[PDB]
Amino acid sequence: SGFRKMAFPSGKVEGCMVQVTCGTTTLNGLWLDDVVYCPRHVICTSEDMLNPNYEDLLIRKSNHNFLVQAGNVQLRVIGHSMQNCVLKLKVDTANPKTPKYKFVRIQPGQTFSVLACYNGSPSGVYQCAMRPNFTIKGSFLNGSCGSVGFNIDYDCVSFCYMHHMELPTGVHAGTDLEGNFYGPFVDRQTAQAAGTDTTITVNVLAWLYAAVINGDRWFLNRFTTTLNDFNLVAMKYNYEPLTQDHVDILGPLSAQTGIAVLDMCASLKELLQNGMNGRTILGSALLEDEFTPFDVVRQCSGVTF
Amino acid sequence: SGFRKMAFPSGKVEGCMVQVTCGTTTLNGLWLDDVVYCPRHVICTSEDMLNPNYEDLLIRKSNHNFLVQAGNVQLRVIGHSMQNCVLKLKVDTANPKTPKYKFVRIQPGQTFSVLACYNGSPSGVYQCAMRPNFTIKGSFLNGSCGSVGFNIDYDCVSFCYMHHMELPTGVHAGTDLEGNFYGPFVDRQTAQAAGTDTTITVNVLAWLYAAVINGDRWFLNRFTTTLNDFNLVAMKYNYEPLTQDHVDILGPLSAQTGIAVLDMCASLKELLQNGMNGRTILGSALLEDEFTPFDVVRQCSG
Ligand SMILES: O=C1C[C@]2(CCOc3ccc(Cl)cc32)C(=O)N1c1cncc2ccccc12
Numbered sequence: 001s002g003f004r005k006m007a008f009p010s011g012k013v014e015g016c017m018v019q020v021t022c023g024t025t026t027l028n029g030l031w032l033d034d035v036v037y038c039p040r041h042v043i044c045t046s047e048d049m050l051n052p053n054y055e056d057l058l059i060r061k062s063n064h065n066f067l068v069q070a071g072n073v074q075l076r077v078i079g080h081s082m083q084n085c086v087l088k089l090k091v092d093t094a095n096p097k098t099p100k101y102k103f104v105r106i107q108p109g110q111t112f113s114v115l116a117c118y119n120g121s122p123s124g125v126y127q128c129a130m131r132p133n134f135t136i137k138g139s140f141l142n143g144s145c146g147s148v149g150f151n152i153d154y155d156c157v158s159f160c161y162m163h164h165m166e167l168p169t170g171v172h173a174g175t176d177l178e179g180n181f182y183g184p185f186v187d188r189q190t191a192q193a194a195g196t197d198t199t200i201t202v203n204v205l206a207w208l209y210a211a212v213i214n215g216d217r218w219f220l221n222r223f224t225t226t227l228n229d230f231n232l233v234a235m236k237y238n239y240e241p242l243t244q245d246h247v248d249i250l251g252p253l254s255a256q257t258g259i260a261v262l263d264m265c266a267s268l269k270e271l272l273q274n275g276m277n278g279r280t281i282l283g284s285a286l287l288e289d290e291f292t293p294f295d296v297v298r299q300c301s302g303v304t305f
Numbered sequence: 306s307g308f309r310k311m312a313f314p315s316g317k318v319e320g321c322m323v324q325v326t327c328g329t330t331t332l333n334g335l336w337l338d339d340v341v342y343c344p345r346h347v348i349c350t351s352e353d354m355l356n357p358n359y360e361d362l363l364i365r366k367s368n369h370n371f372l373v374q375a376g377n378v379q380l381r382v383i384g385h386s387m388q389n390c391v392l393k394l395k396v397d398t399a400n401p402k403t404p405k406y407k408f409v410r411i412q413p414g415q416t417f418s419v420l421a422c423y424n425g426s427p428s429g430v431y432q433c434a435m436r437p438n439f440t441i442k443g444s445f446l447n448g449s450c451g452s453v454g455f456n457i458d459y460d461c462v463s464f465c466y467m468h469h470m471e472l473p474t475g476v477h478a479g480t481d482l483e484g485n486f487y488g489p490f491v492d493r494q495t496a497q498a499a500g501t502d503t504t505i506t507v508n509v510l511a512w513l514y515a516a517v518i519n520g521d522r523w524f525l526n527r528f529t530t531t532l533n534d535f536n537l538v539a540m541k542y543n544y545e546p547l548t549q550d551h552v553d554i555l556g557p558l559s560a561q562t563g564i565a566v567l568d569m570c571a572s573l574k575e576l577l578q579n580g581m582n583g584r585t586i587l588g589s590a591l592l593e594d595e596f597t598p599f600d601v602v603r604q605c606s607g
């Protein structure tokens with residue numbers, strides 16, 4: 001029993017974090033095999049960041065301009081190239097702690113663990129989800145650039161996020177490990193804002209199933225609904241539309257608890273129109289949307305890595 | 306910006322988790338140097354958990370009865386002893402991944418990271434606090450016994466908890482790394498219940514200071530209070546009494562925000578009275594009590 005926002009063990013990722021310094025800028029890098037991946041804004045100065053030309057800035061730089069540090073050992077840069085918004089620094093030494101890995105691009109609603117680092121040294125680990133507006137509600141300070149997001153499936157680490165910047169509202173923006181941003185953002189100091197966010201409907205449903213599995217049933221009712229009627233209700237409360245794919249994905253949870261997905265949708269509809277009335281679900285007064293159906297099954301079963 | 310329930314990087318602890326098997330029981334162990342520490346209930350069978358005699362059960366065991374596994378390698382047990390409710394198995398090999406460590410006993414209200422393991426293999430990591438009733442609101446299933454709680458302050462790992470059992474209410478009970486339980490609990494299957502829990506007042510105050518540091522002030526008011534008047538109001542909402550030590554501890558946060566601890570206490574008094582009225586503090590509709598003053602300074606300042 002118990003339900004917590006659980007992160008994947010960070011150990012395999014800790015052995016990859018390095019500190020990257022170019023000029024006056026210092027951020028984090030990911031050292032996999034003989035390459036260090038880091039945000040390309042490590043080459044930017046104060047004047048440069050206003051309107052940067054990264055090809056023009058990079059072409060001036062030589063290998064010795066980049067100081068890469070792995071603990072107390074200095075790694076010597078022997079080459080460099082740019083891939084979208086990420087800088088790939090070829091180093092003379094392959095990381096002996098390189099795990100089995102893949103670079104994956106995740107979709108909004110999907111979750112991942114974040115290893116927050118400062119000066120190539122990891123400080124903490126937390127769990128979070130890619131919001132529908134493509135931002136992440138993370139916990140980051142200046143110097144956290146280059147911190148990575150990941151999932152660990154069996155023994156393989158799937159890198160899905162590299163932190164780049166914070167938006168004026170306190171939320172965070174970054175790219176996949178191939179340099180492509182999540183969201184309509186750019187790596188430049190400019191007026192940018194996160195779009196209006198929405199609630200991840202499929203995840204709230206998964207979390208309602210997790211509450212039922214842990215002995216919380218007060219919110220259940222005898223009623224059911226159609227997917228069409230539920231979506232008209234959810235649209236009014238700024239919830240993401242629920243698709244047939246979401247219904248199929250919630251299948252195993254529906255069978256484990258004996259509550260149909262449309263039956264659970266009718267419970268969610270009552271919570272939206274009437275609230276909790278002084279009650280909580282899994283120790284929360286708000287409807288939690290940062291646990292996917294897969295996270296619920298992995299936590300209420302005990303899967304190891 | 307941003308405020309999350311953040312755990313310490315688990316890597317140093319992952320390199321210590323082993324699987325311990327005695328008879329039919331299988332749980333987790335902590336391998337530090339040439340010793341494996343695990344809950345002593347690994348020697349108990351079916352008609353043993355009600356009224357076990359651990360000295361009589363252990364005296365019947367030899368070294369070769371304990372199978373210790375570190376990944377795919379089997380560790381050889383060369384000795385054994387019991388320390389309170391923990392079993393210490395001497396092994397022939399010192400752990401090459403043994404970090405710099407200390408065994409610390411924490412007090413109620415204090416927080417720590419938990420590395421949840423099954424069959425000596427870590428599955429997840431989360432943050433949690435020792436509740437005033439000495440239990441932890443954790444996430445554990447059968448096979449999680451021997452999972453450990455820790456803090457990593459600087460480069461040293463401070464082991465403070467080892468998981469032993471789940472109480473009928475869904476909460477968890479365990480010991481420090483010297484086998485002394487936290488709470489009036491026993492490693493028996495007898496009828497045991499967690500005492501009535503209370504809210505960690507000092508932690509809610511620390512979390513209110515964290516909200517002010519992140520730009521939120523709606524809950525502040527023009528009033529102040531005395532410590533005694535605040536405690537009379539707090540006791541009605543099942544809050545732990547706030548002591549002079551708690552006031553001193555909140556000192557740096559009071560100076561950083563410019564808000565006196567007794568003025569922040571008046572905000573909490575009002576919050577308890579009014580609720581939130583459709584508003585949230587740091588993305589929460591409830592008053593969070595699982596972040597200490599130290600956790601707030603760590604996450605907001607460095
Ligand atoms: O360290 C940096 C570099 C910076 C600074 C602003 O100008 C830019 C412009 C573009 C880019 Cl890609 C990055 C940055 C940025 O957002 N961060 C941070 C990143 N995450 C959280 C943060 C919190 C507080 C201050 C900074 C933070």
Ligand SMILES: O=C1C[C@]2(CCOc3ccc(Cl)cc32)C(=O)N1c1cncc2ccccc12
Nearest residue numbers: 001346445446447448450469470471492493494
């Ligand atoms: O694996 C064990 C052994 C056990 C089983 C019950 O009898 C006892 C009696 C004493 C002791 Cl020290 C441990 C146990 C126990 O609580 N757990 C668990 C531990 N954490 C969570 C759990 C959830 C669901 C089932 C079991 C759980």
Ligand SMILES: [Cl-]
Nearest residue numbers: 410411412415
């Ligand atoms: Cl303590």
